[PDB]
Design a protein around this ligand. Structure first.
Ligand SMILES: NCCCNCCCCCS
Ligand SMILES: [K+]
Ligand SMILES: [K+]
Ligand SMILES: [Zn+2]
Length: 620
């Protein structure tokens, strides 16, 4: 039922600055906050979001994650002169205090809870809070690393207390380790913390052994703290995505969180003087989009770091773009992760394998267009449409006399005539985005759709098809890759066929969609995705599938549904229109026959498609 997307911001949080000379903190300036809002203003996104107002956080909300002794210590800072403030900040590591910092810290906190209420009250689908100071480094009784109060921690405790939540996912994609978040929920299994961060074998700030993949949680919460330590700088987009596909996304879907909260730090981006990574701002449109099908979209993004005033604004806009459902930009040049990345991904997978057994190994403004059958009318969301013109049918009959001399079924040449002009509408006219047509028979509809697609032009076409038997698709020339889910052996590299027989069919389809299907497709970088579903059901996953694949081809997907299914066609096109995606509940474990099936496919393909690799290669 939820609709919009909240943007909480207030220029008041830019009214505090570092005063004395301090090389540690000089990177943390008020312009971080104004540059990123005026960047949202320029690109026309800030205006597109419900502007929830900032509030102060009550002292009983602050005591949720801090001690009265440290609350009172901070509470006295507004009365101090700079002789007294630079003495109070020396008591902590890499943090500075201002006359207004306590006031703004309460705003940064309350602005987060404002966002939590907005999302959880179904008032908005998701949202982001542009706040200052950051949060993830502050602890129960200490300010640390530009942070005063742990904003993201408040949101989790707050949503737990005031909404009776059992499963919250915190994703900290800032490039520093949020130790205050890990400390807070260390023994807590209801808040699943994930943090990737620049480690350099403990050489980088905050220089903690708890930031390592060693630490997984104390007591009854063990397995709900996940640290991915980057041990070398210069991480590429492929490094960030392989981390999602192979540790974060598999854990998040079998965790099935009821609310996703993000520590959005953009010092993890290229050009940041502190992160020294190489991920482009576009990657955050995908890190955001890959997380949308969790918690039915209820996602609360909260700003942390990001210190290149140029590179900061660009990545903030890529994030809000995907929150509003705008098409995610294609990512080219993707490949295998770097060797150290594969090292730490392999290490963290192993330690956590005793808690998530999906990690075990054998010992060694119109968006969508629908075309239902004629005479069928249906109720559709506010970004959909229906059907042919003279110049379209001219080619449709041309195609007939050349390749289909013996086919006179007026139902099917309406199948093909629509297929052509929806593709003409998607690629050529650039008006509509996605599409779904219900076709009569496939051998003619699939062949017609694919061949007309390459001449749009479509440099590369990813084809996802569920059902048994081969199709009329030539997969040899390298301009088309085929994913098939059926009930068969495999030979060439540009294909991938899966057969899972079962009650865990929805659990295996996910562990194979994140483990295999997504990493291939992202490296493949198509211009168009072609979905095909034959009449031969089990649709708990199609919504998630049809949603996560739209990270490719800049969203442009066409679906061929054979045989009208009221509840199926309703499921596909709402995933295409961008609606919230229904959770699966917690994902159970797949069968050993099916995971042994999967690793046989990974090792068979990971040489051409390096994004499949989740362990570092054994040199010959
Ligand atoms: N060059 C000195 C930086 C000290 N480390 C501060 C950590 C700030 C991260 C907040 S996201
Ligand atoms: K982090
Ligand atoms: K935890
Ligand atoms: Zn940071």
């Amino acid at each position: 039922a939820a609709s919009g997307s909240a943007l909480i911001f207030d220029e008041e949080m830019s009214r505090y600055k570092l005063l004395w000379t301090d090389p540690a903190c000089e990177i943390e300036v008020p312009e971080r906050l104004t540059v990123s809002y005026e960047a949202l203003r320029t690109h026309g996104l800030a205006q597109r979001c419900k502007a929830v107002p900032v509030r102060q956080a009550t002292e009983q909300e602050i005591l949720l994650a801090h001690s009265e002794e440290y609350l009172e210590a901070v509470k006295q800072t507004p009365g101090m002169n700079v002789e007294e403030l630079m003495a109070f900040s020396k008591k902590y590591n890499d943090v500075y205090f201002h006359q207004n910092i306590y006031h703004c810290a309460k705003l940064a906190a309350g602005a987060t809870l404002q966002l939590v209420d907005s999302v959880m009250k179904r008032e908005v689908r998701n949202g982001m809070a542009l706040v200052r100071p950051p949060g993830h480094h502050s602890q129960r009784s200490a300010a640390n690393g530009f942070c005063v109060f742990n904003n993201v921690a408040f949101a989790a405790l707050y949503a737990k207390k005031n909404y009776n939540l059992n499963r919250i996912l915190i994703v900290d994609w800032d490039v520093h380790h949020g130790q205050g978040i890990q400390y807070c929920f260390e023994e807590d299994p209801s808040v699943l913390y994930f943090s990737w961060h620049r480690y350099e074998h403990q050489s980088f700030w905050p220089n903690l052994p708890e930031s390592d993949y060693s630490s997984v949680g104390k007591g009854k919460g063990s397995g709900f703290n996940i640290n991915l330590p980057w041990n070398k700088v210069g991480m590429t987009n492929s490094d960030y995505l392989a981390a999602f596909f192979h540790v974060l996304l598999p854990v998040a879907y079998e965790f099935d969180p009821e609310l996703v909260i993000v520590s959005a730090g953009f010092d993890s981006a290229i050009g940041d003087p502190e992160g020294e990574m190489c991920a482009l701002p576009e990657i955050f449109a995908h890190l955001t989009h890959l997380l949308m099908p969790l918690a039915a979209g209820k996602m609360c993004v909260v700003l942390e770091g990001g210190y290149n005033l140029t590179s900061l604004g660009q990545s903030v806009c890529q994030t809000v773009h995907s929150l509003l459902g705008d098409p995610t930009p294609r990512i080219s040049g993707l490949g295998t992760a770097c060797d150290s990345a594969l090292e730490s991904i392999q290490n963290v997978r192993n330690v956590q394998s005793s808690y998530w057994s999906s990690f075990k190994h054998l010992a060694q403004s119109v968006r969508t267009v629908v075309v239902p059958p004629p005479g069928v009318e249906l109720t559709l969301p506010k970004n959909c449409q229906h059907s042919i013109s003279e110049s379209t049918a001219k080619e449709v009959q041309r195609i007939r006399d050349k390749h289909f001399h013996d086919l006179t079924d007026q139902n099917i040449l309406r199948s093909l005539g629509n297929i052509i002009s929806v593709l003409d509408r998607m690629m050529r006219s650039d008006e509509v985005c996605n599409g779904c047509v219900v076709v009569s028979d496939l051998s003619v509809s699939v062949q017609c759709a694919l061949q007309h697609a390459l001449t749009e032009p479509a440099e590369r076409v990813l084809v996802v098809y569920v059902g048994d038997g081969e199709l009329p698709v030539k997969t040899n020339d390298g301009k088309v890759f085929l994913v098939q889910i059926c009930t068969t052996e495999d030979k060439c590299v540009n294909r991938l066929t899966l057969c899972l027989r079962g009650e865990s069919l929805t659990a295996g389809f996910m562990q194979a969609l994140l483990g295999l299907i997504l990493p291939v497709a992202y490296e493949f970088n198509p211009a168009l995705v072609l979905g095909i579903v034959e009449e031969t059901r089990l649709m708990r996953v199609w919504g998630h599938m049809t949603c996560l694949i739209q990270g490719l081809a800049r969203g442009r997907m066409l679906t061929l549904l054979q045989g009208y299914d009221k509840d199926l066609l309703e499921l596909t096109v709402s995933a295409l229109s961008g609606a919230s995606i229904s959770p699966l509940g917690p994902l159970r474990a797949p069968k050993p026959e099916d995971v042994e099936m999967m690793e046989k496919q990974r090792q068979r393909l990971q040489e051409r498609w390096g994004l499949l690799r989740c362990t570092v290669s054994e040199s010959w």
